[PDB]
Every structure is written in structure tokens, then in C-alpha cells.
Amino acid sequence: TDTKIYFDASNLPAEWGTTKTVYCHLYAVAGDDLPETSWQGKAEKCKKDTATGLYYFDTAKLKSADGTNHGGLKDNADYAVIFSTIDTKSQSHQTCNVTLGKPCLGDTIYLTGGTVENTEDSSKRDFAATWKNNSDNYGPKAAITSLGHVTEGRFPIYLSRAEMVAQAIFNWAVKNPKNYTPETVADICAQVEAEPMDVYNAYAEMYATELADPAAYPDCAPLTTVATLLGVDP
Ligand SMILES: OC[C@H]1O[C@H](O[C@H]2[C@H](O)[C@@H](O)[C@@H](O[C@H]3[C@H](O)[C@@H](O)[C@@H](O)O[C@@H]3CO)O[C@@H]2CO)[C@H](O)[C@@H](O)[C@@H]1O
Ligand SMILES: [Cl-]
Ligand SMILES: [Zn+2]
């Protein structure tokens, strides 16, 4: 019945300093059109439970694009969540990505110890975190990073391995070509168990609209680049 998820901000590492504000970055990976919230913006702000000291975020208050209530998490969808803070020195801290499903509603994310490569920023490591009661089926989300590394954790159910690699190439091949080399893309395929030609076909279908208008979408690698990175001849 509880549509809230909770964050244990007690006994944080010294690096986190004194928590001032807590934020929840909850997003769909596959099977939902959930709008993404601005990182550490108003829509992400978590309330403090003054009784328990836990912070919480109500998934029942997630908004759709038309500003109405989204009607909660969907059953046949992959979600991921990050809890973050701004400390009394205005410095940001965050958990890694943790997989999220309906069984996790009413449960608490806590820091496990250890850090992991930030997905966006090679200068940063996030803090390993998982669910208190749902770690059997949910936990750290395996992510393809800005460097083309595949982080520790679980893979999605409703996003194919080929689609995951296609999305990484779409995200990073133009932005970070010194990392997104043919060697790196071969390594990604090996780590996520995707067939390169499946990645090429997935990319071509997924990003057809952007591929048709390079002038408008310059961060979308053209098919010729994607074929070269995957070592395939289409
Ligand atoms: O929205 C989906 C997206 O969410 C997560 O990305 C967030 C990062 O985890 C978070 O750190 C932040 O990234 C910023 C860096 O902290 C900052 O140093 C600098 O590099 O800018 C980054 C933003 O470009 O915000 C993003 C969300 O925008 C998740 O990790 C991703 O895998 C996921 O795709
Ligand atoms: Cl890792
Ligand atoms: Zn790495």
C-alpha cells in the first residue's frame, strides 16, 4: 500500500558532510514514458520523516508530461533510482543507480560501503547502495558509462542487451570518441552479451529520425561511424 521509497541518511561517510537537502532522481529505463526530473531540482526534493529520521519520495506524486499524476510505477517496466544530497557546504553527493520495481515500494535505500564509477563524469565515484528488504531481486544497476565501462549490478528485463549498447553509442560515440573506440565497443558487446550486428540494426531502427537530420542531431553518430565502432559490414 505504501507508494513511498525511503533513504537512510544516518551514519553517512565523512565525505557526505552534514546533509542540508535530499533529492530522488527516479527514471524509466524501459516500458514507461515517465518524464525525467531536473537533477537536484524542486521536483526531486525529498521530505524528512521527523519520527524515523529517514528521507522519502512518494512515487504516487510523479507527474506525467500533461502535469497530471502519473498513476504510479508500471508492472512491465524497468526503473532506476538515485538518492543524492546537497551538504551545508553546497557540495553534491549521491548513491549509484539502483534498480526499482513495485516490490521496492515502502522499502529503504542505504549505503553498503564501496564506490563505483559515475555514469556521466569520469572524475566522480558514486556510493554503492541497495534495498534493505528487496536486495534479493533489486540493487545496483549495471550501467554503460561515459568511458564505455559496464558497471557492477543487474541488467534490465525489458531493454535488450543490443538496445543497451546502441543507446551507449548514441549517448557517447560523438561526445567521447577517445573512449568510444572500436576496442571499447567490442568490450561493451562482450560484457553485456550483445551481438554487434544486433547493435547496428537496433541503432539504425531506434535513431532513424535523428540519422535523417544530421544538421539537427550532431551528437547522433552516423551509421558509417556505428559500423566502424562495431567492426561490422552492413
Ligand atoms: O536521467 C537518467 C540518467 O540519470 C543518472 O544520471 C545523473 C548522474 O548520475 C548525476 O551524477 C548527474 O550527472 C552530472 C554530474 O554529477 C556532473 O558532475 C556533470 O558531469 O554533469 C552530469 C550531468 O550531465 O545527473 C545525471 C542526470 O542528468 C544516471 O546515472 C544515468 O545513467 C541516467 O541516464
Ligand atoms: Cl564496476
Ligand atoms: Zn570505468
Kindly provide the resolution of this structure in angstroms, with one decimal.
1.5
44-50, long-range: CB within 8 Å, 24+ apart, which pairs? 44/84, 45/21, 46/7, 46/21, 46/22, 46/83, 48/22, 49/6
Residue 172 region by backbone torsions, left for phi larger than 0, else alpha for psi between -120 and 50, else beta = alpha
- Ligand 1 pocket, residue 150 CB under 6 Å: no
Q: Considering every ligand atom, which ligand is closest to the CA of 97?
A: 1
Strands in 36-119 per DSSP E: 47-48, 55-58, 78-87, 92-94, 98-100, 108-117
Nearest CA to ligand 1 atom 17: 121
All three cell numbers of 152: 557492477
Instruction: Domain ranges for the chain, please list them.
Output: 4-131, 161-230
As a 3-state breakdown, the chain gives helix, strand, coil percent values, each rounded to 5, of 25, 25, 50
All three cell numbers of 160: 535488450
Give me the count of residues in the chain.
234
What single-letter amino acid sits at 39? Answer: W
User: 151: CA distance to ligand 3 center in Å?
Assistant: 7
Nearest CA to ligand 1 atom 13: 120
- Ligand 1 pocket, residue 121 CB under 6 Å: yes
User: 149: CA distance to ligand 3 center in Å?
Assistant: 5
At residue 200, the 3 state secondary structure works out as helix
Q: Cβ neighbours of residue 205 under 8 Å, at least 6 residues apart?
A: none
- Determination method here? X-ray
Pocket test for ligand 1, best of 39, 84, 96, 155 (most atoms within 8 A of CB): 39
In 29-180, alpha helices (H):
161-172
